[PDB]
Ligand binder design. Structure first.
Ligand SMILES: Nc1nc2c(ncn2[C@@H]2O[C@H](COP(=O)(O)OP(=O)(O)OP(O)(O)=S)[C@@H](O)[C@H]2O)c(=O)[nH]1
Ligand SMILES: Nc1nc2c(ncn2[C@@H]2O[C@H](COP(=O)(O)OP(=O)(O)OP(O)(O)=S)[C@@H](O)[C@H]2O)c(=O)[nH]1
Ligand SMILES: [Cl-]
Ligand SMILES: [Cl-]
Ligand SMILES: [Cl-]
Ligand SMILES: [K+]
Ligand SMILES: [K+]
Ligand SMILES: [Mg+2]
Ligand SMILES: [Mg+2]
Ligand SMILES: [Mg+2]
Ligand SMILES: [Mg+2]
Lengths: 483, 483
């Protein structure tokens, strides 16, 4: 199927995502949305029986999600339902009402399969290979243990934002009683890990709060890294704030009434898992469902050196992809030839290579200021499998090809672990020279270094590359000569 | 063909552009560059005989231009040569040298054909119907009188930057004698007009100086508007400035030694033509050659309401047109139904409709912050046939969909002729509401207004559009009801 829709019927949000497959492993999100259906509303006092008005909302929302699926030409529609529906004594009647109302067939999935879908999404689309997912939803919480990219254990707990809200916080029961109820279940998690992968609306909402509080310069939550020890006190503080204080923190209206129980659950989980770093995930069940299919014949794992963001970016914006292979190759040779001078950690060849592949991507928008467009593309869409640092470096290399990187760059100082200006200027200068040298179909280039003299060996005239040489911004005083 | 390279052998710059046809009328630039070949160097003192080292440069640049054309898989290569080559007693040996060196067939064109090509580009790719082109090159200056989109007269004058530089300025001849010489040729221009279309490197260079001088917020040469009366004195001053003063003004190193001649010629032309408004053209001879082929069967003119930037942007990023056509339709209806309240000039329906078509273009990059990506695409690539004002308005409409436009927005204050903030907030709100209503293919919507009450008439549940109603930002107090 070229276009596939996933519908994730949660206990609070119902989510929709439309995926377009661009190659064997390349894909991107054509459309996504979520609706605050809260099918679980009022069910927890009636033995999980889904109530009439909430069921009516679900049907109406699901009908429009189906319309959206067909509006985008989906060849397949996969619909899964989690905690509130699987717990519900009348679950089979709701499934039947939905089928009769719109022809959608719902597959109730158990907690372990829900944990797996979140694990699959995070194991493949984040930048850490090992860790534990935390998928806090309105009705349940899933944790999947991931080790070097493979799922090793799945657990689902019957604690969720709306469950806690209706059983405890709505009744003005002391928050201590809710914490105990949560801890009693969180005790059952049989594993610990320095890394956690934060999944779901509570955690993404909390991540937006933290980004705003610390004036974070990158506006995308997929991959945002949270120091769990530093921030656990604030997370616990959120549990007891009132609605207007949450508003001042930036929480949107629709999320005000569930975020505090959600924050309580997250705090108990993080304490138990001994998490030190939580990475915010922009993906979860709906993406994992799609990947279960995409990767069904590949053991639910992208092959080594297969990155779906990189690949889909090239399918969308660079389908004649040999030029960029040459620039990458020359960037490698240049980096080796100059290593006596720059002595930069070869870990940064990773970023240089990718900037080599992507630096002319923005010409599909305009050939004027093309590198500025490439940088924009890279910063906003090179997401799966890249840290924010990885993205910022690659972005800067492309953005400042043939230019001086400012001292005052927000992205460059995004973190104290970022590479130095000089290192960034070196890699950008290398990218620039490689680009100049690959302008034509010049072949068999060789670089030698003697003192501060770079010599470019070629039997080609390289007339245009020689003409452009003075427009390079060198990282240090260095002479470039053509032999 | 699909991919077409054009090479324009000027007397100073030699330019290359690779065009990609995406549809019957859609196209965009795959690649472009220019090389300071200056084939005319030293020819003016030897009756126009092209000199040996300049010809060698040309052969070396043109052989690599051919390589670039083939690298991009050009099916057709169109190569024309202008003043210095057409004037040269040895023109036929240079042409044959180039043919033997790389198989490029140079077609020497006379001054009228040169004026025609610039005219075709400007008549089609600029936003004014009538005016006179001013194409100052190294050897000659062309003017094409355009009226209502149609070429009515062509003249070529033997004044250019390198000609004047070598005949007068290089010899420390009083600038007065050079002006007198130019005035004698400009005298032959038999027409006048309030509008001028600026073509070539001199005028683009001057436009960049002016954009920097005035802290202009849109970094885009194409379409930039220059008050010729207010700036003529500054243009004339440029003629008397030193290299380093030109550097301080931002002039590129390669442009320093020709811009003063070019400014002298331009000031004389603007005075004679009575120009009050000059529009900087990002296109010229090379685009005119491509268009004369593209439009060979359409009398060198796009059909009414055919805009190649709009179309090509949709070809590249929106190969599915029916969604965006629905949003535009609702934007028109909403506009008309709300006009008792907003009372906005109907001239702005033009921008609203195009924002309706393009507002979700950016989702091809990311579905998160998609409207921000769309605005970026529009501001940087919606160029042919649009003023900077048109581009800015359309950009802002998409950018601030479902948001409040800040009071201090740089683009919004780009010029005093911009629409008011309130008008802009109105248009954005209409777009936002249209977008909500077209989420699903809600068919046959109708609108009525009573006082400040908008009533939406539908047979649809419009469940999701209602769920989103509170996130619209209204321009004035307004009640929205569904019947
Ligand atoms: N699952 C997931 N949600 C995200 C991600 N990034 C943002 N969100 C959330 O998704 C919702 C939509 O954000 P966003 O897409 O930026 O606005 P929008 O309503 O679709 O309007 P737009 O994108 O056309 S500008 C917000 O609630 C945001 O907090 C992500 O990477 N993954
Ligand atoms: N003919 C034409 N030239 C332009 C236009 N805009 C800018 N230029 C000129 O073309 C040259 C390159 O512009 P530009 O493409 O932004 O830099 P670049 O060297 O190619 O580097 P990049 O685009 O990969 S970031 C400069 O001489 C600039 O003034 C335009 O619209 N038309
Ligand atoms: Cl979310
Ligand atoms: Cl130019
Ligand atoms: Cl030009
Ligand atoms: K969950
Ligand atoms: K000219
Ligand atoms: Mg869930
Ligand atoms: Mg460019
Ligand atoms: Mg010319
Ligand atoms: Mg979005």
């Amino acid at each position: 199927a070229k276009i596939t829709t996933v519908i994730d019927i949660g206990s609070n949000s119902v989510r929709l995502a439309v995926f377009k497959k661009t190659s064997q492993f390349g894909f991107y999100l054509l459309f996504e949305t979520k609706s605050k259906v809260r099918i679980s509303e009022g069910c927890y006092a009636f033995n999980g029986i889904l109530q009439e008005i909430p069921m009516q909302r679900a049907v109406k929302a699901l009908s429009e999600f189906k319309e959206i699926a067909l509006k985008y030409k989906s060849k397949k529609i996969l619909c899964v339902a989690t905690s509130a529906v699987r717990d519900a004594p009348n679950r089979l009647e709701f499934v039947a009402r939905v089928k009769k109302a719109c022809g959608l067939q719902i597959k109730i999935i158990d907690g372990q399969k829900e944990a797996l879908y979140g694990g699959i999404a995070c194991a493949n689309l984040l930048h850490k290979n090992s860790g534990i997912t935390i998928d806090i939803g309105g009705g349940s919480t899933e944790c999947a243990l991931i080790e070097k990219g493979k799922i090793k254990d799945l657990i689902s707990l019957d604690v969720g934002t709306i469950r806690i809200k209706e059983m405890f916080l709505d009744k003005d029961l002391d928050v201590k009683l809710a914490k105990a109820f949560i801890q009693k279940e969180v005790s059952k998690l049989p594993f610990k890990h320095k890394n956690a992968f934060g999944v779901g609306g509570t955690i993404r909402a909390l991540s937006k709060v933290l980004m705003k509080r610390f004036d974070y310069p990158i506006d995308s939550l997929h991959g945002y890294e949270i120091d769990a020890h530093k921030n656990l006190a604030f997370i616990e503080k959120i549990v007891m704030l009132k609605e207007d204080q949450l508003r001042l923190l930036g929480v949107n209206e629709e999320r005000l009434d569930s975020i505090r129980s959600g924050a309580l659950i997250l705090s108990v989980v993080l304490e138990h898992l001994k998490t030190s770093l939580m990475i915010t995930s922009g993906v979860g069940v709906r993406e994992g469902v799609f990947l279960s299919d995409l990767l069904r014949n590949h053991y639910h794992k992208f092959p080594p050196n297969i990155n779906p963001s990189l690949i889909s970016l090239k399918d969308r914006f660079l389908p004649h992809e040999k030029h960029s292979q040459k620039v990458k190759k020359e960037c490698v040779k240049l980096f080796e030839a100059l290593s006596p001078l720059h002595k930069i950690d070869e870990k940064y060849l990773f970023h240089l290579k990718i900037a080599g592949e992507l630096a002319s991507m923005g010409k599909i928008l305009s050939v004027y200021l093309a590198h500025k467009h490439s940088a924009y593309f890279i910063l906003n869409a090179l997401s799966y499998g890249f840290s924010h640092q990885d993205r910022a470096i690659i972005c800067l290399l492309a953005q400042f090809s043939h230019k001086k990187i400012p001292k005052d760059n927000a992205i460059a100082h995004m973190s104290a672990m970022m590479p130095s200006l000089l290192t960034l200027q070196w890699l950008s200068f290398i990218l620039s020279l490689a680009e100049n040298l690959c302008l034509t179909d010049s072949h068999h280039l060789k670089y030698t270094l003697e003192k501060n003299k770079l010599v470019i060996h070629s039997n080609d005239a390289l007339y245009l590359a020689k003409e452009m040489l003075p427009k390079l911004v060198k990282p240090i005083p260095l002479t470039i000569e053509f032999a």
